Design an enzyme around this catalytic site. Structure first.
Site, PDB file in Angstrom:
ATOM      1  N   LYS A 162       0.854  -1.181   0.000  1.00  0.00           N
ATOM      2  CA  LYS A 162       0.000   0.000   0.000  1.00  0.00           C
ATOM      3  C   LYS A 162       0.889   1.229   0.000  1.00  0.00           C
ATOM      4  O   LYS A 162       0.649   2.185  -0.745  1.00  0.00           O
ATOM      5  CB  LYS A 162      -0.927   0.025   1.216  1.00  0.00           C
ATOM      6  CG  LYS A 162      -2.361  -0.369   0.908  1.00  0.00           C
ATOM      7  CD  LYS A 162      -2.823  -1.579   1.710  1.00  0.00           C
ATOM      8  CE  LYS A 162      -3.920  -1.216   2.686  1.00  0.00           C
ATOM      9  NZ  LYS A 162      -5.102  -0.678   1.974  1.00  0.00           N
ATOM     10  N   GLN A 182      -4.414   0.214  11.347  1.00  0.00           N
ATOM     11  CA  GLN A 182      -4.005  -1.179  11.386  1.00  0.00           C
ATOM     12  C   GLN A 182      -4.616  -1.870  12.594  1.00  0.00           C
ATOM     13  O   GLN A 182      -4.560  -1.353  13.714  1.00  0.00           O
ATOM     14  CB  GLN A 182      -2.487  -1.277  11.438  1.00  0.00           C
ATOM     15  CG  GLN A 182      -1.943  -2.488  10.736  1.00  0.00           C
ATOM     16  CD  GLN A 182      -2.218  -3.785  11.478  1.00  0.00           C
ATOM     17  OE1 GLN A 182      -2.156  -3.835  12.706  1.00  0.00           O
ATOM     18  NE2 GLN A 182      -2.531  -4.839  10.735  1.00  0.00           N
ATOM     19  N   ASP A 210     -11.710   2.060   3.396  1.00  0.00           N
ATOM     20  CA  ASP A 210     -12.028   0.648   3.581  1.00  0.00           C
ATOM     21  C   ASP A 210     -13.522   0.394   3.440  1.00  0.00           C
ATOM     22  O   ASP A 210     -13.930  -0.706   3.049  1.00  0.00           O
ATOM     23  CB  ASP A 210     -11.551   0.170   4.957  1.00  0.00           C
ATOM     24  CG  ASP A 210     -10.372  -0.785   4.881  1.00  0.00           C
ATOM     25  OD1 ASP A 210      -9.929  -1.128   3.764  1.00  0.00           O
ATOM     26  OD2 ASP A 210      -9.886  -1.200   5.954  1.00  0.00           O
TER      27      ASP A 210
END
Lengths: 285, 285
Positions: free
Chosen positions: B54, B98, B121
């Protein structure tokens, strides 16, 4: 012959449970839950909705507050009022009656409501939390149907559930309630091919299309639970559901009558949501 | 039979190239590149692998990325203040936190602190709810990437009987709402479903998301079904197989996603898409 899911009785139980809880809060020196209702304009239909919410609040001992704003009200002024109500510690539920004036962004206004005061349960945050198996305030009609199943001790886990209609107000949130309840969940709608095949396999059938007699009763699986959300006014003044009752009742184990089935649970669940907001989110002990 | 391949690796390359082209055009118009922020608390190389995929996956298309690495001891209040800062940073279009976070930190409160228009997301409840109610904004990546596969292969979805195996928040649940949006009759199965095979055997479109290698035999596939395999199951062996027995499903399906190289690359491509969308529609329009 199917057993009747008596929604009028269950709704009265729920409202009585809320009322007794408010009684206990009063006895303990705590404030009663509070509902704020906002209106813009004077459409006779909407007038009825205020009456019904003030009525439902008075019934269980809530505080209610009604804002009747003139049609001249700007979007900025309405959003300021929502801000004020979001910040008012005595208000647990905020309702904004629709339609609003054509020049007002309905979505911006409704989404300005803090989710923990969205007792209608349709703020995207609340629908999303229900979708994520972590519900907060839930859409009233689907949650009221879950209450019906609970109060008749109907085990939902493992059932093949079929929803007829994918409406935002019922069908879609109903599917997320059913999944949370452990049902295998099928959502059908206007593009569904061979509805009869789906209905015949449904242990639990929720019909929410607003079309009188859309589902013939001999489609019902023998032993199925039939929840009929339709309230269809007919020519001769009769009110009838989306399922043909006479033939469905010969086959179902349980069936909701129309009227007196799902209908009363909607308002009762609103009252239930408002107490929940107060007891769980705003004035916890 | 010989099912056609749904070549996710190739479609993802098309998506990423389309994004890179729009990024280049923005740069040529004197506009900033989209920006991604990644938050890491601690040091386990769980985080550290995915983040790198990413740091340059978003760079391959020309995004700017920035990674915050906070000490394991970071408090929930400091982490929330960091999200507040990124929400207010106009050069940041997407925020990724994360997981897992250290015990003692409310993961939900941290993730929900992200502004929905930077939740690339797509897992913020506001975004899930918007999708559920037919007004999607940023969409969950894996289900949206699957919809893209169907569109790019010109698969008509309206009226298909679609079955989703698994009801996870990250795939199964949002997948059912994407497929309803696309006009499919939708069934969601899970651990409580009776006779899974019966649902599968009638599926025009099958989304398998249970994370178990070869869990779905080819035997169950409806002749001509479209088979979407979200499983990425690493065997004691190295390399990966899907939730579906490819060799046997390919005999009966009309289309099938291989593993690796099907849904997998589309999940990342959709995040890239979501970050560009957030930049172009919501932040720097």
């Amino acid at each position: 012959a199917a057993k009747i899911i008596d929604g009028k009785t269950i709704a009265q139980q729920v409202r009585s449970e809320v009322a007794q809880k408010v009684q206990a809060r009063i006895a303990a020196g705590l404030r009663a839950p509070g509902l704020a209702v906002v209106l813009v304009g004077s459409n006779p239909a909407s007038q009825i909705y205020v009456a019904s919410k003030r009525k439902a609040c008075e019934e269980v001992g809530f505080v209610s507050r009604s804002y009747d704003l003139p049609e001249t009200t700007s979007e900025a002024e309405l959003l300021e009022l929502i801000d004020t109500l979001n910040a008012d510690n005595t208000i647990d539920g905020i309702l904004v009656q629709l339609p609003l004036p054509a020049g007002i962004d309905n979505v911006k206004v409704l989404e300005r409501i803090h989710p923990d005061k969205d007792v209608d349960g349709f703020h995207p945050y609340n629908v999303g939390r229900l979708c994520q198996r972590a519900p907060r305030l839930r859409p009233c009609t689907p949650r009221g149907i879950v209450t019906l199943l609970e109060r008749y001790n109907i085990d939902t886990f493992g059932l093949n559930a079929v929803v007829i209609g994918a409406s935002n107000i019922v069908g879609r949130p109903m599917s997320m309630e059913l999944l949370l309840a452990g049902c295998t969940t099928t959502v059908t709608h206007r593009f569904t091919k061979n509805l009869r095949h789906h209905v015949e396999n449904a242990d639990l059938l929720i019909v929410a299309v607003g079309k009188p007699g859309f589902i013939p009763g001999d489609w019902i699986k023998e032993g199925a639970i039939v929840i009929d959300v339709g309230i269809n006014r007919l020519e001769n003044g009769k009110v009838v559901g989306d399922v043909v009752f006479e033939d469905a009742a010969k086959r179902a184990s349980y069936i909701t009558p129309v009227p007196g089935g799902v209908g009363p649970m909607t308002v009762a669940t609103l009252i239930e949501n408002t107490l929940q907001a107060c007891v769980e989110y705003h004035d916890p002990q």
